[PDB]
Design a protein around this motif. Structure first.
Motif, PDB file in Angstrom:
ATOM      1  N   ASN A  30      31.360  48.288  49.275  1.00 31.42           N
ATOM      2  CA  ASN A  30      30.483  47.185  49.647  1.00 31.42           C
ATOM      3  C   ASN A  30      29.040  47.572  49.372  1.00 31.42           C
ATOM      4  O   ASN A  30      28.731  48.735  49.115  1.00 31.42           O
ATOM      5  N   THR A  31      28.156  46.573  49.413  1.00 30.14           N
ATOM      6  CA  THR A  31      26.714  46.779  49.421  1.00 30.14           C
ATOM      7  C   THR A  31      26.124  46.020  50.602  1.00 30.14           C
ATOM      8  O   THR A  31      26.796  45.196  51.227  1.00 30.14           O
ATOM      9  N   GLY A  32      24.835  46.264  50.878  1.00 27.37           N
ATOM     10  CA  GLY A  32      24.191  45.696  52.045  1.00 27.37           C
ATOM     11  C   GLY A  32      22.838  45.085  51.729  1.00 27.37           C
ATOM     12  O   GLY A  32      22.303  45.209  50.614  1.00 27.37           O
ATOM     13  N   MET A  33      22.296  44.388  52.737  1.00 23.91           N
ATOM     14  CA  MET A  33      20.913  43.937  52.756  1.00 23.91           C
ATOM     15  C   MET A  33      20.398  44.102  54.185  1.00 23.91           C
ATOM     16  O   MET A  33      21.134  44.542  55.071  1.00 23.91           O
ATOM     17  N   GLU A  34      19.122  43.772  54.408  1.00 16.65           N
ATOM     18  CA  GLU A  34      18.498  43.924  55.722  1.00 16.65           C
ATOM     19  C   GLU A  34      17.457  42.842  55.905  1.00 16.65           C
ATOM     20  O   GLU A  34      16.737  42.518  54.965  1.00 16.65           O
ATOM     21  N   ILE A  35      17.332  42.345  57.139  1.00 11.56           N
ATOM     22  CA  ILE A  35      16.248  41.461  57.541  1.00 11.56           C
ATOM     23  C   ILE A  35      15.640  42.080  58.796  1.00 11.56           C
ATOM     24  O   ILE A  35      16.304  42.150  59.839  1.00 11.56           O
ATOM     25  N   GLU A  36      14.406  42.571  58.683  1.00  9.44           N
ATOM     26  CA  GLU A  36      13.671  43.159  59.805  1.00  9.44           C
ATOM     27  C   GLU A  36      14.519  44.187  60.563  1.00  9.44           C
ATOM     28  O   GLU A  36      14.610  44.156  61.793  1.00  9.44           O
ATOM     29  N   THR A  37      15.130  45.116  59.806  1.00 13.63           N
ATOM     30  CA  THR A  37      15.976  46.239  60.221  1.00 13.63           C
ATOM     31  C   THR A  37      17.420  45.843  60.562  1.00 13.63           C
ATOM     32  O   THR A  37      18.263  46.737  60.699  1.00 13.63           O
ATOM     33  N   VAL A  38      17.752  44.561  60.684  1.00 14.19           N
ATOM     34  CA  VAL A  38      19.138  44.178  60.947  1.00 14.19           C
ATOM     35  C   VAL A  38      19.954  44.391  59.674  1.00 14.19           C
ATOM     36  O   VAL A  38      19.659  43.804  58.630  1.00 14.19           O
ATOM     37  N   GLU A  39      20.998  45.215  59.756  1.00 13.77           N
ATOM     38  CA  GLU A  39      21.821  45.511  58.587  1.00 13.77           C
ATOM     39  C   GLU A  39      22.885  44.435  58.418  1.00 13.77           C
ATOM     40  O   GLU A  39      23.564  44.067  59.380  1.00 13.77           O
ATOM     41  N   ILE A  40      23.007  43.912  57.205  1.00 17.14           N
ATOM     42  CA  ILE A  40      23.886  42.789  56.902  1.00 17.14           C
ATOM     43  C   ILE A  40      24.786  43.172  55.731  1.00 17.14           C
ATOM     44  O   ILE A  40      24.297  43.608  54.685  1.00 17.14           O
ATOM     45  N   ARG A  41      26.095  43.015  55.908  1.00 20.26           N
ATOM     46  CA  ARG A  41      27.039  43.280  54.827  1.00 20.26           C
ATOM     47  C   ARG A  41      26.900  42.195  53.761  1.00 20.26           C
ATOM     48  O   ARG A  41      27.076  41.004  54.044  1.00 20.26           O
ATOM     49  N   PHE A  42      26.557  42.598  52.539  1.00 19.26           N
ATOM     50  CA  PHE A  42      26.105  41.672  51.509  1.00 19.26           C
ATOM     51  C   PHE A  42      27.197  41.305  50.504  1.00 19.26           C
ATOM     52  O   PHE A  42      27.419  40.115  50.272  1.00 19.26           O
ATOM     53  N   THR A  43      27.901  42.288  49.919  1.00 21.92           N
ATOM     54  CA  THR A  43      28.970  42.033  48.956  1.00 21.92           C
ATOM     55  C   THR A  43      30.137  42.981  49.194  1.00 21.92           C
ATOM     56  O   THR A  43      29.992  44.031  49.818  1.00 21.92           O
TER      57      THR A  43
END
Ligand SMILES: [Mg+2]
Ligand SMILES: [Mg+2]
Length: 206
Positions: A30-43
């Motif tokens: 998988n890969t990830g992203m972040e919004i204001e330190t919140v880690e979000i599973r992206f793909t």
């Protein structure tokens, strides 16, 4: 046969759009992203290759996975340069607009090309045109992106926002240095998916 990767089904054998060369699933992650330190599973993603990739990488069999993925091991470069067909299937978990996605690719590829002293005028315009290809698209949850390296020197890009497997390719990266840098993004020492790379190294070292 299918493996479940983040609740997404990945076929264990796969021929990329417009191709009759059947590739084996080597590893997934998988890969990830972040919004204001919140880690979000992206793909979720799967890396595919002709099964002869194991024989090309024979010298790595039996070694520990930790020794394969480690900096300066030499494994990453060999994996990236093996001359068989390869592909990556990306399935979008959190939706994104095309321009931010393409601009992030541009940033990461520029980093790798400048590291090699390969960011000349040709490469800079190849990245700009890749961003422009992605910009009019939306990539909602479920979208599929295929990157297919028929040779190490080009990438056929296929895209289905509706979440089917495409039958035609939408764009071709013809710049050899950009093509190798995009494979380094996933399988290099600074990979954006340590999960996928660790998974591939397990399969080669098995
Ligand atoms: Mg537009
Ligand atoms: Mg190009």
């Amino acid at each position: 046969q299918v493996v479940n990767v983040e609740g997404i089904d990945f076929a264990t054998k796969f021929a990329p759009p417009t191709s009759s060369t059947e590739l084996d699933l080597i590893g997934h992650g998988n890969t990830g992203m972040e919004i204001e330190t919140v880690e979000i599973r992206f793909t979720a993603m799967g890396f595919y290759a002709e099964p002869s990739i194991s024989e090309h990488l024979q010298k790595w069999k039996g070694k520990a996975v930790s020794e394969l993925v480690e900096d300066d091991s030499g494994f990453h470069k060999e994996l990236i340069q093996v001359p068989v067909e390869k592909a990556v299937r990306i399935s979008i978990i959190k939706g994104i607009k095309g321009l931010p996605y393409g601009s992030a690719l541009q940033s990461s590829l520029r980093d790798r090309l400048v590291n090699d002293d390969k960011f000349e005028e040709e490469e800079e315009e190849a990245l700009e045109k890749l961003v422009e290809f992605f910009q009019p698209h939306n990539l909602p949850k479920g979208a599929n992106i295929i990157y297919h390296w028929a040779t190490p020197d080009t990438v056929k890009i296929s895209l289905s926002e509706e979440g089917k497997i495409p039958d035609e390719v939408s764009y071709t990266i013809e710049d050899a240095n950009v093509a190798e840098a995009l494979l380094d993004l996933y399988l290099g020492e600074n990979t954006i998916t340590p999960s996928t790379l660790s998974s591939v190294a397990e399969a080669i070292a098995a």
